[PDB]
């Protein structure tokens, strides 16, 4: 019934997966051994065994073993079956070409064989949720290779991404802009909808809202997990809005290439906030239109909306929501493209957002996640494209990719595709 | 010669002009030897310290003192290309034709090092152009072996 297969690629993808699956278990009342004392929509993400154990419909892949070794030794080692945790020996060394060709082509068949085994257990497979970074050799190269191979094996089946956009505060490779552009070009025609998560936006929210002096991946992932859970709650719980993967595309994607929605989450409150009580529906809704709560750094006031979805969770009443949307209409200079229905799409789940016990986030009575397709997101591509241009003009580090069987033409091709994408965002809502 | 000796060798190789003068006055042995048999004069001849070569010789250093390999300061200033030191040693009684343990003469060493002006000065002072090393090589044979045309022309007339 309506299954969704999650694929976690490379370090970022695997570590975000750990945070997501930990949170899903807490949300559905599933214990770390797969047992639940609590049919139901969570079955789209968890299969059930004869022994009453609930197993994530997921595959974890990394070309090096260390990150996944933590999953198979950690809390949650009994949650996943060993066959769904796949590791090689040598990583892609922050090189897209090693991920896509040299190293990736060694494990691709095995990964497809494991996804095939998971798909065989599905009666109504909707498609795939792919988690990866843009910057890593596996996250970039292996993901693009996997995306191409999934289009061959699954045809028309929906594929959504959760992509980690690089930030220098936490970057590990000088070549991240190259890896980002190459993966974006290769994956573009294979992805239906992609939610970019800018590590700088998350880093700044952790610093500003959670009073974390120096955010670590642990801090970033707990916050990322909260946004992912909001986006996937529509699939894992019984709603009206974005109940399936096809509904994501219909509601957020007006043009095939313009498939990058902006997520805005509110409220993000520190566990140390002691007297400061509960935020209203109006307050949390207003917070969605402020750039500081965004998952990607960009300015929507400088852009045009082409689709808007508000996903509320907890103590929220429809009368409170409509009142909030109406005031937003009279307030903020919120412009929609001329060729579009100027209207929001509202989702309301009565379960308040769940927080991980020793986490940095406070438990709130009501939260909201706004998903918006805005031309302002083109600013994130421009930042990345400029860094690419600076290095590429000198062919700096190019030898590393060419050595692994890539052609220089692939760099030019990828960059021209990015230039056409920037041109598309400009043309859209002229 | 004790603490003063190690300090004199150090000062001579470091080119500490004043510090050499002080140690002399304090009674440092002019011919105090290092682990290799080198005297402050050999060290000053290696490092190219002219003023030190002169103070040492004025304070009665042994101009022909041979180290453990049998090299005199003349062999060393010739090898290291110190023209002015080669002229100073020669003016103070250096053995033009001194032989080390390898059968080398300062002329073999200046030829092998390719120091034309040193060869010209060694010959002026009586360097034996016909002298053979333990490899059975003369300064001229070294010159042709190294492929030094300029030098081979210079030595051909005599040899």
């Amino acid at each position: 019934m309506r299954e969704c297969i999650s694929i976690h690629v490379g370090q970022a993808g695997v570590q975000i997966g750990n945070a997501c699956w930990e949170l899903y278990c807490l949300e559905h009342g599933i214990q770390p051994d797969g047992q639940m004392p609590s049919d139901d929509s969570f079955n789209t993400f968890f299969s059930e065994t004869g022994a009453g154990k609930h197993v994530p419909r997921a595959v974890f892949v990394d070309l090096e073993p260390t990150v996944i070794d933590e999953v198979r030794t950690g809390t949650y080692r009994q949650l996943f079956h060993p066959e769904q945790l796949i590791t090689g020996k040598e990583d892609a060394a922050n090189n897209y070409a090693r991920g896509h060709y040299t190293i990736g082509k060694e494990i691709i068949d095995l990964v497809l064989d494991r996804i095939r085994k998971l798909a065989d257990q599905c009666t109504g497979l909707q498609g795939f949720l792919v988690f990866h970074s843009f910057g890593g050799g596996t996250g970039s190269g292996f993901t693009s290779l996997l995306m191409e191979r999934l289009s061959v094996d699954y045809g028309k089946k929906s594929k959504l991404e959760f992509s980690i956009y690089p930030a220098p505060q936490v970057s590990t490779a000088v070549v991240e802009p190259y890896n980002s552009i190459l993966t974006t070009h290769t994956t573009l025609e294979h992805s239906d909808c992609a939610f970019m998560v800018d590590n700088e936006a998350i880093y700044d929210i952790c610093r500003r809202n959670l009073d974390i002096e120096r955010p670590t991946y642990t801090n970033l992932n707990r916050l990322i997990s909260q946004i992912v859970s909001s986006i996937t709650a529509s699939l894992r719980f019984d709603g009206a809005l974005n109940v399936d993967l096809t509904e994501f595309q219909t509601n957020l994607v007006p043009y095939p290439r313009i498939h990058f929605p902006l997520a805005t989450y509110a409220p993000v409150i520190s566990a140390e906030k002691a007297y400061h009580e509960q935020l209203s529906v109006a307050e949390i809704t207003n917070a969605c239109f402020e750039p500081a709560n965004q998952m990607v750094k960009c300015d929507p006031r400088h852009g045009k909306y082409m689709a808007c979805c508000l996903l509320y969770r907890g103590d929220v009443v429809p009368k409170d929501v409509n009142a909030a949307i109406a005031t937003i209409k009279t307030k903020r200079s919120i412009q929609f493209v001329d060729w579009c229905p100027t209207g929001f799409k509202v989702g309301i789940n009565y379960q308040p957002p769940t927080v991980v016990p020793g986490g940095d986030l406070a438990k709130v009575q009501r939260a909201v996640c706004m998903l918006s397709n805005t031309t302002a997101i083109a600013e994130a591509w421009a930042r990345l494209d400029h860094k690419f241009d600076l290095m590429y003009a000198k062919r700096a580090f190019v030898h590393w990719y060419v050595g692994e069987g890539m052609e220089e033409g692939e760099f030019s091709e990828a960059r021209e595709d990015m230039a056409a994408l920037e041109k598309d965002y400009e043309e859209v809502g002229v | 010669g004790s603490d003063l000796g190690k300090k004199l060798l150090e000062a001579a190789r470091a080119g500490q002009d004043d510090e050499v003068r002080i140690l002399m006055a304090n009674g440092a042995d002019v011919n105090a030897e290092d682990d290799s048999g080198k005297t402050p004069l050999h060290l000053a001849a290696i490092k190219g310290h002219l003023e030190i070569v002169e103070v040492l010789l004025k304070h009665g250093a042994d101009v022909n003192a041979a180290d453990k390999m049998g090299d005199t300061p003349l062999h060393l200033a010739a090898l290291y290309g110190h023209l002015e030191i080669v002229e100073v040693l020669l003016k103070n009684g250096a053995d033009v034709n001194a032989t080390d343990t390898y059968g080398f003469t300062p002329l073999h060493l200046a030829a092998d090092a390719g120091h034309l002006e040193i060869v010209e000065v060694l010959l002026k002072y009586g360097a034996d152009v016909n002298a053979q090393d333990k490899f059975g090589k003369t300064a001229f044979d070294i010159s042709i072996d190294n492929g030094n045309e300029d030098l081979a022309e210079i030595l051909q007339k005599l040899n």
């Binding site: 082509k105 062919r395 030898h399 060419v402 050595g403 692994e404 069987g405 220089e408 692939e410 | -």
Partner: protein
Amino acid sequence: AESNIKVMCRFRPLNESEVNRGDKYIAKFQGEDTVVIASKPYAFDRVFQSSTSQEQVYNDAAKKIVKDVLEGYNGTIFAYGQTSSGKTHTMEGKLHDPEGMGIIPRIVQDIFNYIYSMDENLEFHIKVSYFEIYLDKIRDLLDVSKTNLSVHEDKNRVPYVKGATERFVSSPDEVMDTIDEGKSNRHVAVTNMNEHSSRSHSIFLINVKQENTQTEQKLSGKLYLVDLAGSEKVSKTGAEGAVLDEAKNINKSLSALGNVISALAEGSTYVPYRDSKMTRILQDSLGGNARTTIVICCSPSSYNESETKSTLLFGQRAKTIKNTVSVNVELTA
């Protein structure tokens, strides 16, 4: 006296693979020198349409290089292009078919035909070498024992492959026997892009040395005749295993060739000739003393548009590079 590198573009008819799929002939041609791809004109020294013959290519590209080599100059002709654009076809061809042979067998003939015409009191001494750069190693194509030859510098700091089989030829027949021997050692594999994909960079070198019995005058000419392997996307070639390892190396030496050209057209004070072995062999052809002609090969298929564009833009860049060509002395100080 100087004169820029001559760059000449040759389009081949659409292949079976192309035809047996959609593929539109994307090249449009204005005059004898311009090709137009996507309303952008790319102009060269002479553009050959798909219909152009092997004798037509020869007459407009080389033939001139034969006079020059004989006169004491250095000549270089190399075919640049994407996988299966016609590099080996232009250069080698049907080695023995009179109408079907390439540039190399035609040069070999016209070398001797011109010589028989030359001054009776002119002593010629022709030696030839044939080698490949397979897997970034200089393998001799006339000695199978010589598998890793080294690029060295001459007195004038001019690189050359030291120790290749130098064979003294006296007749065109003597040369063809050795080209036949060479070809039949040259690495070839099967890519989805080309059934007989060249897997190495073929370097044929004619070394003509002439002395006049009366003038006591000596002349020398190094003639480089390079059939390069083609740039290839794995997506297109289907290159896997040893075929891909071959590809890794082709793209590497090739991006380096581009870097050398880029550098020279931009006039950057450096030029990274020391990057690929190939780019050190061509060092003279590229900045200095050689009259160079580059034959750029293109596939008029819509499938290969991106790549055809990148080959044209290399051509454009390359055409600007000014050589410092003079006569070869063979002097004694």
